[PDB]
Design an enzyme around this catalytic site. Structure first.
Site, short mmCIF file in Angstrom:
data_model
loop_
_atom_site.label_atom_id
_atom_site.label_comp_id
_atom_site.label_asym_id
_atom_site.label_seq_id
_atom_site.Cartn_x
_atom_site.Cartn_y
_atom_site.Cartn_z
N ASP B 383 0.85 -1.18 0.00
CA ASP B 383 0.00 0.00 0.00
C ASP B 383 0.89 1.23 0.00
OD1 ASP B 383 -2.31 1.75 0.33
OD2 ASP B 383 -1.71 1.91 2.43
N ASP B 416 -4.30 6.30 -3.96
CA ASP B 416 -4.12 7.66 -4.45
C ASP B 416 -4.28 7.70 -5.97
OD1 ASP B 416 -3.48 10.43 -4.47
OD2 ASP B 416 -2.14 10.10 -2.75
N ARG B 513 -6.50 4.85 -7.41
CA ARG B 513 -7.91 5.10 -7.15
C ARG B 513 -8.65 3.79 -6.89
NH1 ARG B 513 -9.21 8.84 -4.89
NH2 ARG B 513 -9.26 11.02 -5.60
F1 ALF Z 1 -2.77 3.46 3.17
AL1 ALF Z 1 -3.25 3.58 1.44
F2 ALF Z 1 -3.73 3.72 -0.29
F3 ALF Z 1 -1.75 4.51 1.08
F4 ALF Z 1 -4.74 2.64 1.78
#
Ligand code: ALF
Ligand SMILES: CCCCCCCC/C=C\CCCCCCCC(=O)OC[C@H](COP(=O)(O)OCCN)OC(=O)CCCCCCC/C=C\CCCCCCCC
Ligand SMILES: CC(=O)N[C@@H]1[C@@H](O)[C@H](O)[C@@H](CO)O[C@H]1O
Ligand SMILES: CC(=O)N[C@@H]1[C@@H](O)[C@H](O)[C@@H](CO)O[C@H]1O
Ligand SMILES: *[C@@H]1O[C@H](CO)[C@@H](O)[C@H](O)[C@H]1NC(C)=O
Ligand SMILES: OC[C@H]1O[C@H](O)[C@@H](O)[C@@H](O)[C@@H]1O
Lengths: 324, 815
Positions: B383, B416, B513
């Site tokens: 992530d 993002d 996204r």
């Molecule tokens: F912590 Al994220 F997209 F950076 F869920």
């Protein structure tokens, strides 16, 4: 803050051995060099031991006493001539083997009350309920209960040496020293009540198949009940369908003459135990003993095979390992 | 489709804001937990054997067979009860909270779980929304609000939603004025970006104003409000239907990569045990057909074994054989794995390398069942914000290189936009210069079947012809949404298939996204494609808690956001540079220890119960156990169950200081090698050979009629004791050869097992207590070793048995 105990950090001191081709190869040679000599030793010792097996079960009219393979309910006798080629020198032991007699069965190996045979004043009058259906006869408890002691081997074997003439010469057979010392001295003790035996078994009854109560097996005061050497050696089970129970010990003479000189003998047997029903065979094994036990070739052949297949494999791997 | 009344007044069938994430009801925890446990194939066979032992016949005591089956059912049940009570108490703190509502011309304050669809909620600055409101007004004009969805997308940039235009005048001023309104929305959906509705505010007499709504007016739940005094919404979705509780999917039961091979081993040993029992019974009743082999005048059934029906005794004998060959499958491999896992989960906690000075804490292990799966991972679904970048982290690049070297395939499922999640990825080394991006974002797929041709052009004529390190894909939540949800349109040329092939054929993938659920959809397709590539996911925030519950071993990071995605993670590491040391030095060792423990707990019992079956041919198939009644009970407990525990608990297959410095090694245990069909047959053909050597090499040894210098016979308990000494010595020397990390505890425990076997054989036999109903093994072990040929036979058998291992060593070494 950080608990730095050299154990929790997975960093204890270790040996971390490194064993491979160049470090184990000499093992495949030490094995051979230490297994070939022992192999030859215990294959020559198991080869210089003499024995003989004289089946006398009958089963064929061509036998000396097939006459008793189907006799009346009375004592029987035989005479099975056997001759020794090379006499025995050391101590000689006389066994009595059987065949197809499953003394290791489950319904059979548990048919016994050990507390009783160990001399428990209570059990002597109330044996357990596992040794069935030989538990109580004539609304009384059998002294030795269970199917093991009930079916004791009650044959009488006797050897006679035929000297230069036809006069048969008897041989000295001693019964004492055939049963494990541990058991006869401790595991098997007579009931404690009193001193005289016939009064210790008051609410008892000889086994069904037996023919004489347990207090009359032998008059000898130290071989009379629940410790009769033959009785003990029978109460030890067989572990196979074909076993061989020690019967008598013939002691080596003081002189240097052979314990059993070579020649002909007589095997006077009082046939009683019938083993033709279950396609069994009885026989008498006369054998000497050595440092490692009776005559058995297996151990020698196994040690030799292991030593040789270790030496050869070691040489093969050494040649190829050097070849890279 | 759903018509809600703003003021709830005229001119019900929906949930009332009660998030229920737990699984077991407080009242029916047992009637559900025991049924979920006793459905397995092992935990039910154990109960069948326990009941058979208690009913028909047992060589050992019923307690030593049904007492472990209790410690294994009471411990797993307590584990599950606690990991369920945790979610109960964590949802209790999300419900029963304070949420003010305009009940009747006044500001009543109810509990969040008592809010019903269609009532004007209120929210102060910096408050998680109580439900999916519909921004209706605001103290200030312009009908704007600054919401920051940190708990949905995971980004913290200030969004702005506009309230309803014509209703900006209502600010505590008669908002209960029978306010005419009716929001006709669409059925709840997890899209999180599409919402089409309409307002029908009626005026004094009657109005026809229809201000259509969009995603700009929707205020999801879990999105803190910034820079505002107070707002006014109308709950449209509330409870198990809101767009934050629709993207949860629930938590599945995670089973390791080993707990399935143990189950296959058990289902094969069930067949081996049934074959043994059936063949022994068949040969028993073909043998007892001879009139004089049953009750031959020296042992005769009293009356009951003569009158008992023929077809019931066959079944009772089959059951006796089954119970007697019960040991093949060991119930002592579960009461041992429990301790092994419970004590091994502590080396991940204490390890001083997992200590971050800033937050002043370390690692954390929430589940002790997935340790054996840290050395099997194949993918890493990371992530972007918070995990990768906090300006990348301390070692966010070297760790990704170490994860590309060890064979893994690192993906990036971020939240993002494609503009920023691409630059970071271009800095983390995930995208090298000569990487030809295959961009499938919504900025190039403006059509329905256009992407259909995109996928063909990319796969059937661009990539599927092969250069495996040049291409790196990129997607969005608008393209993947079609690709997946509309994957039921083509089945002759499956969309999901073409897309999954492209993804698995590229070097690295990205996803910008991405709604919370689409992550779980990706990590649910990857878990199914072509077998079962063990997947991993390492999130930081309360939006990753879906793929952290959908992956196989969800690692959670303890970052700035909070502990909402760390308490639902199977582990915890306060960095990303740790995910290398966690799954290279703790996955390899854990998997190696567990695989060897399983292999050994099966071999040590097959080799133990093979002779006890071979013997049936030399008995009258009477089920007479070769060994004594104390050895059958103590073997798995004290004799050989001590060493393997200490091995499994502390043994470095390869020194850890070398495991993390050379990440190439992780490729030797990647495909579940250590428990595949190869080694399972190497351990089932070593036991089925040692168990014949023992027996027949003692049987040939008992053809002499005497083994002592004084010529005395040996019973049938000395057979058992010789074979048992050979067996214990061999199954301890096998482990003493396999262990390659000899601490002060391994020498001690191993040699102590042998010394205690000897001392126990000596002490059990030699003293009449008496509390035993039988004196079988009184003086067997002493009189057995008081011979000279017995030592030689045993020293020959313990080597003829270990020959195969010493040979495999010398051969699996050179070339
Ligand atoms: F912590 Al994220 F997209 F950076 F869920
Ligand atoms: C010279 C001497 C050297 C020193 C030697 C000392 C050794 C002393 C003994 C050490 C402790 C015992 C270790 C036992 C380890 C193995 C335990 C085990 O699995 O036992 C299983 C065994 C059944 O075996 P089988 O009958 O073969 O199973 C198949 C049947 N068809 O069942 C039992 O152990 C039953 C006896 C009661 C067990 C009670 C357990 C209580 C819970 C322990 C929790 C331990 C911590 C857990 C943390 C989480
Ligand atoms: C097979 C055999 O010989 N057994 C019989 C047995 O029935 C009898 O009661 C006992 C005494 O006569 O000895 C004999
Ligand atoms: C049976 C007995 O007690 N002694 C006998 C003797 O009577 C018999 O004639 C001799 C030759 O067979 O063998 C012995
Ligand atoms: C010897 O034992 C057998 C079998 O128990 C029995 O039938 C026979 O009568 C006995 N003969 C004796 C005691 O001489
Ligand atoms: O011939 C068999 C014989 O054995 C003894 C008794 O138990 C009866 O069976 C019979 O007197």
């Amino acid at each position: 803050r950080p608990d730095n105990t050299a154990f929790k950090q997975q960093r204890l001191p270790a040996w971390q051995p490194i064993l491979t081709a160049g470090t184990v190869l000499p093992i495949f040679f030490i094995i051979g060099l230490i297994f070939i000599p022992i192999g030859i030793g215990i294959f020559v010792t198991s080869n210089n031991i003499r024995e003989i097996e004289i089946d006398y079960t009958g089963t064929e009219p061509s036998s000396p006493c097939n006459k008793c393979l189907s006799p009346d309910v009375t004592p029987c006798f035989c005479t099975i001539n056997f001759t020794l080629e090379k006499s025995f020198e050391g101590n000689v032991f006389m066994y009595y083997g059987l065949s197809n007699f499953y003394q290791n069965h489950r319904r059979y190996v548990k048919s016994r009350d050990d507390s009783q045979l160990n001399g428990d004043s209570s059990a002597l009058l109330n044996p357990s309920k596992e040794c069935e259906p030989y538990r109580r006869n004539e609304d009384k408890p059998i002294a030795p209960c269970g199917a093991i002691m009930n079916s004791m081997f009650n044959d009488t074997l006797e050897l006679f040496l035929i000297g230069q003439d036809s006069y048969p010469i008897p041989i000295a057979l001693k019964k004492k020293g055939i049963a494990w010392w541990t058991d006869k001295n401790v595991k098997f003790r007579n009931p404690p009540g009193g001193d005289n035996l016939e009064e210790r078994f008051k609410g008892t009854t000889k086994p069904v198949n037996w023919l004489k109560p347990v207090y009359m097996l032998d008059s000898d005061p130290d071989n009379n009940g629940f410790i009769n050497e033959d009785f003990i050696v029978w109460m030890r089970t067989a572990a196979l369908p074909t076993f061989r129970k020690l019967y008598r010990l013939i002691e080596r003479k003081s002189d240097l003459h052979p314990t059993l000189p070579a020649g002909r003998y007589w095997l006077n047997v009082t046939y009683n135990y019938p083993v033709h029903y279950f396609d069994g065979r009885k026989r008498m094994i006369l054998s000497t003993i050595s440092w490692m036990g009776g005559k058995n070739p297996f151990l020698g052949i196994a040690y030799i095979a292991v030593g040789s297949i270790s030496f050869l494999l070691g040489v093969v791997l050494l040649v190829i390992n050097h070849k890279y | 489709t759903r018509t809600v009344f703003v003021g709830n007044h005229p001119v019900q069938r929906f949930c009332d804001n009660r998030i229920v994430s737990s699984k077991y009801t407080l009242w029916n925890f047992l009637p559900k937990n025991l049924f979920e446990q006793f459905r397995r194939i092992a935990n039910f066979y154990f109960l069948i054997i326990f009941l058979v032992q208690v009913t028909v016949d047992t060589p050992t005591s019923p307690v030593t067979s049904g007492l472990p089956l209790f410690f294994v059912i009471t411990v797993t049940a307590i584990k599950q009860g606690y990991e369920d009570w945790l979610r109960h108490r964590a949802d209790n703190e999300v419900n029963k909270s304070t949420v003010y509502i305009i009940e009747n011309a006044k500001r009543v304050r109810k509990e969040s779980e008592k809010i019903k669809v269609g009532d004007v909620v209120e929210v102060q600055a910096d408050e998680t929304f109580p439900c999916d409101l519909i921004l209706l007004s605001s103290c200030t004009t312009d009908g704007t609000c600054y919401v920051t969805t940190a708990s949905l997308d995971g980004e913290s940039n200030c969004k702005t939603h506009y309230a309803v235009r014509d209703t900006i005048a209502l600010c505590t001023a008669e908002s209960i004025d029978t306010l005419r309104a009716a929001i006709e929305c669409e059925q709840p959906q997890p899209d999180l970006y599409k919402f089409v509705g309409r307002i029908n505010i009626y005026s004094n007499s009657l109005e026809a104003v229809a201000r259509s709504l969009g995603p700009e007016n929707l205020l999801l739940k879990g999105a803190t409000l910034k820079n505002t005094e107070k707002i006014y919404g109308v709950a449209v979705y509330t409870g198990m239907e809101t767009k934050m509780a629709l993207n949860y999917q629930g938590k599945s039961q995670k089973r390791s990569a080993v707990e399935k091979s143990i189950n296959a081993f058990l289902i094969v040993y069930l067949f081996i045990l049934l074959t043994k029992a059936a063949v022994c019974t068949t040969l028993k009743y073909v043998w007892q057909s001879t009139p004089y082999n049953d009750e031959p005048w020296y042992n005769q059934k009293t009356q009951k074994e003569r009158e008992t029906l023929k077809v019931l005794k066959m079944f009772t004998d089959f059951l006796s054989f089954m119970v007697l060959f019960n040991f093949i499958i060991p119930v002592s491999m579960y009461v041992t794995v429990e301790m092994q896992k419970f004590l091994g989960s502590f080396f991940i906690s204490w390890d001083k390398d997992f200590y971050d000075e800033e937050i002043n804490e370390g690692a954390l292990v929430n589940t002790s069942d997935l340790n054996e799966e840290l050395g099997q991972v194949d993918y890493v679904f990371t992530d972007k914000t918070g995990t990768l970048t906090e300006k990348l982290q301390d070692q966010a690049a070297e760790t990704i290189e170490a994860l590309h070297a060890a064979g893994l395939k690192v993906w990036v499922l971020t939240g993002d936009k494609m503009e920023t999640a691409k630059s970071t990825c271009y800095a983390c080394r995930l995208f090298q210069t000569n990487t030809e991006l295959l961009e499938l974002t919504t900025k190039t797929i403006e059509e329905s079947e256009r992407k259909e041709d995109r996928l063909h052009e990319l796969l059937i004529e661009y990539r599927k012809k092969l250069e495996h390190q040049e291409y790196g894909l990129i997607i969005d939540g608008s393209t993947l949404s079609l690709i997946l949800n509309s994957s039921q349109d083509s089945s002759s040329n499956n969309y999901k298939s073409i897309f999954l092939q492209i993804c698995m054929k590229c070097t690295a993938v990205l996803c910008c996204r991405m709604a919370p659920l689409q992550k779980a959809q990706i990590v649910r397709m990857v878990k199914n494609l072509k077998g079962s590539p063990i997947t991993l996911s390492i999130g930081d925030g309360a939006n990753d808690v879906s793929m952290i519950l959908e992956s196989h071993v969800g690692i959670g990071i303890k970052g700035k956001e909070g502990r909402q995605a760390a308490r639902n993670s199977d582990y915890s590491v306060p960095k990303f540079k740790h995910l290398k040391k966690l799954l290279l030095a703790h996955g390899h060792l854990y998997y190696v220890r567990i695989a060897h423990l399983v292999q050994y707990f099966f071999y040590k019992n097959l080799c133990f119960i093979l002779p006890q079956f071979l013997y049936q041919f030399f008995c009258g198939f009477s089920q007479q156990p070769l060994y004594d009644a104390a050895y059958l009970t103590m073997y798995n407990i004290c004799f050989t169950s001590l060493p393997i525990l200490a091995y499994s608990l502390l043994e470095q297959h390869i020194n850890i200081d070398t495991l993390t410095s050379d990440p190439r090694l992780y490729m030797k245990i990647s495909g579940n090698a250590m428990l595949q069909l190869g080694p399972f047959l190497y351990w089932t053909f070593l036991a089925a050979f040692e168990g014949t050597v023992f027996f027949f090499g003692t049987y040939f040894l008992f053809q002499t009629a005497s083994l002592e210098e004084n010529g005395k016979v040996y019973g049938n308990w000395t057979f058992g004791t010789i074979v048992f000494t050979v067996l214990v010595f061999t199954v301890t020397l096998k482990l003493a050869l396999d262990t390659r990390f000899w601490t002060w505890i391994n020498h001690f425990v191993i040699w102590g097992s042998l010394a205690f076997y000897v001392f126990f054989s000596f002490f059990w036999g030699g003293i009449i207590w008496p509390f035993l109903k039988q004196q079988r093994m009184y003086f067997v072990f002493a009189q057995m070793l008081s011979s000279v040929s017995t030592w030689l036979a045993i020293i020959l058998l313990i080597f003829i048995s270990l020959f195969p291992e010493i040979l495999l060593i010398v051969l699996k070494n050179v070339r």
